[PDB]
Design goal:
The complex is a heterotetramer, with two copies of chain A and two copies of chain B.
Chain A lengths: L1 E8 L2 H4 L3 E9 L6 E13 L2
Chain B lengths: L1 E7 L9 E5 L2 E3 L2 E5 L6 E6 L3 E2 L10 E11 L9 E8 L26 E6 L14 E6 L6 E4 L8 E8 L4 E8 L2
Antiparallel strand pairs in B: 2-5, 3-4, 7-12, 8-9, 9-10, 10-11, 12-13
Classes of the chains: A mainly beta, B mainly beta.
The complex binds a molecule of 2 linked components (GLC-FRU) (2 copies), calcium ion (CA) (2 copies) and manganese (II) ion (2 copies).
PDB class: lectin
Keywords: lectin, carbohydrate binding protein, calcium, glycoprotein
Assembly: tetrameric
């Protein structure tokens, strides 16, 4: 098993709008490769 | 309280709860963003808008996402450009391609992009990527020049298990990637 | 495997994860379908399509939904027409109003409607409603003439707690409405 | 505490499409009333 971790402080409320859409992106240029997703789950909780 | 959740372990040929852009589509129970072809882009977004924060209360959401991805490269040593998980305005369309990953338009900070992304960058772009030239995981905030990176060894054709979480109590975005080997 | 879930304990003025039709809108932490006015319709749908069944495997989803609703009638003796929780094609628009509850267009089975609804019917429509003339809860399948009903005593202005669940193993749809008094 | 329960067999697979949208409706006619929703939750699981 090979693992990696990365983290930082991101002031979300100052960068993205109140409502957003989430997703995946992938691109190729002069060099390329196939990019695929096998499974995906998401959960968000905003309090009042 | 407002929550949004979903899980998909196998993709249908017509996965109606997703919005596809560019070359993105489902095939063989997988979500494909690009095939091994030059200069293309593919994106896939969850259908429902997600409530991340609220101005009146100042409340910010806690969130977590899990996904497994695979990059298949004909020549294991000539690979580009990468893949990301992103959070953007509800009406987002593909941005600059190539090294910009379809989510950003400059290495310069652009407040108007209003996008945060976690990139899995497989190609060294001299104009802004880490000087060691390593492929890497990065946290991007309104720019393709990551606020933080970690060197990552791409394992061609292997399933990368990713977890990305955001803690609203600390504004901390954490990323983890694991390979079976 | 696929799951979809969401929770809204109180509505915000800009509920982007809902699609509004007719008179529907959010205000003062509540979702207004209709105000106390004649000949109108209001609907609100969850933004993301939901996967209810799969043709290849033949599998059908299990699901549960809970909600609290209130009916405020300016009168105690003249109330109409009702409210429903419904499951319909992804691009559904309001159907016939009045006694048809904005979900059906006839009391005859119409396979093209492709809609199942749980109604909380407050007005006796002689052509198809239960002859006892009581207000009632009903299960509707491609028709306003319910396949099953249960007499219900409307409590003007009281919060009704509803739970609707579907068991895919038995194809049983169950509905429960509870008032605190 | 007053509860009302109702149940029936409904072959969803033979009535609605594979994909659906769920929602609420409320109407009035010659007689009327205000119809409002205070809270809503939903959970579905399709296992293949
Ligand atoms: O072979 C890559 C080579 O092409 C250039 C342009 O000449 O960059 C293109 O290809 C990269 C790899 O896909 C992309 O990151 C870049 O956006 C695209 O213009 C050179 O910069 C690079 O050395
Ligand atoms: O006042 C009720 C009376 O109105 C009629 C039409 O003249 O029905 C209308 O109002 C009902 C109650 O809101 C609706 O259910 C019906 O769809 C609408 O046409 C009469 O049929 C009814 O007796
Ligand atoms: Ca790069
Ligand atoms: Ca009726
Ligand atoms: Mn990079
Ligand atoms: Mn009825």
């Amino acid at each position: 098993v090979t693992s990696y971790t990365l983290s930082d402080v991101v002031s979300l409320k100052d960068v993205v709008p109140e409502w957003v859409r989430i997703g995946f992106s992938a691109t190729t240029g002069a060099e390329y490769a196939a990019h695929e997703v096998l499974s995906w789950s998401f959960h968000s909780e905003l309090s009042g | 309280t407002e929550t949004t959740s979903f899980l998909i372990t196998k993709f249908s040929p017509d996965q109606q709860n997703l919005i596809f852009q560019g070359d993105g589509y489902t095939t063989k129970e997988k979500l494909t963003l690009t095939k091994a072809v030059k200069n293309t882009v593919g994106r896939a977004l969850y259908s429902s808008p997600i409530h991340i924060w609220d101005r009146e209360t100042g409340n910010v959401a806690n969130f977590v996402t899990s996904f497994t991805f695979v990059i298949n490269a004909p020549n294991s040593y000539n690979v580009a450009d990468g893949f990301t998980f992103f959070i953007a305005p509800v009406d987002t369309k593909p941005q600059t391609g190539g090294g910009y990953l379809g989510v950003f338009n400059s290495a310069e900070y652009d407040k108007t992009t209003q996008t945060v992304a976690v990139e899995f960058d497989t190609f060294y772009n001299a104009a802004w990527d880490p000087s060691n030239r390593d492929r890497h995981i990065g946290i991007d905030v309104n720019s393709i020049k990551s606020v933080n990176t970690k060197s990552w060894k791409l394992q061609n054709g292997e399933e990368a298990n990713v977890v990305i979480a955001f803690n609203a109590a600390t504004n901390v975005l954490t990323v983890s990637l694991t390979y079976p080997n």
